[PDB]
Amino acid sequence: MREIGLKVQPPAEKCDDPHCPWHGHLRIHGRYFEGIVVSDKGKKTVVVERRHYHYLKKYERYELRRSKVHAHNPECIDAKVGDRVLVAETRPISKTKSWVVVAVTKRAGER
């Protein structure tokens, strides 16, 4: 089983589209982060949200900034709304999708 460049557990089942990194021919390159899923409606398409804090030099304070990313979701990793997914950058898959989910830590409960 292949060993895509960032050490994390692969899925259990091995049947997917060619747009899966592990079982297909899709490649990943560049940056990777963990994020929270906020939509899982589209077929093989989720929305992942980050939450970083931005410093304001003048007011000497911080503000939150949310950023969505629009990743690809292979059926082997059917991440749902709530799950802390790991996402990585790849080629364009669509107009908005240039990222792919690779791994999950599930979340049945949230706050």
């Binding site: 460049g5 960032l6 050490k7 990943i28 390159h29 560049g30």
Partner: protein, 241 residues
Amino acid sequence: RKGAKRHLKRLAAPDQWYISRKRYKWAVRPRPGPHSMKTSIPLLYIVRDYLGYAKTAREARKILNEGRILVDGRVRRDYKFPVGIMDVVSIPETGEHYRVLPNRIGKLVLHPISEKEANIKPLRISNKRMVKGAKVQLNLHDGSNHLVTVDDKDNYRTAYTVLMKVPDREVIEILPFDVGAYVFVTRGKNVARKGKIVEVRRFPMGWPDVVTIEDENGELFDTLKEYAFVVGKEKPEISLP
């Protein structure tokens, strides 16, 4: 806009040239060639500014076309030719040889040397293709290419160094990238620094590998493996600074 660049403004020039940036408007745009723009300088600047054998580019071009300057044993008549790191610039009429190497400030300088060392050029291997005929093409940091066979393909590895006899191009003294190997840095913050290798870290994805290096005075500093140039097994053996 509509195509490529044929010019270079002397302020927009590389930071590693010793160029006098405000005296004129234009600079020599280097040709594509052996090395990169970040690790090179044109032969005109070497002939005119560094060595001072000409105050003028017309004189320098006359010299170069007469054929008085070799670069790795080969006559180079183009004034835009790139001269890069660890390159040997020879003037036989004067009996002089210089190694283009970087400074600690990060700029390129000519270190004087003699004939024996001047017939040597160390080459970081930097890649390894399998080419038709089932042969191995080593793709070297001066943009050069050397063909070897599937017998010593394993003696040849990517970050290694090869000493090369340059007017003939015969490999001598493969120097491997290992612990204890004497190394010369070429870029970065720790530029013209040298020592023995200590450690290598890998960094999963496309993040470059990093090497920890020990200097002569016992200090211990890191840089990139790609910027770590091997010059020896335990001693630099190429008369660096």
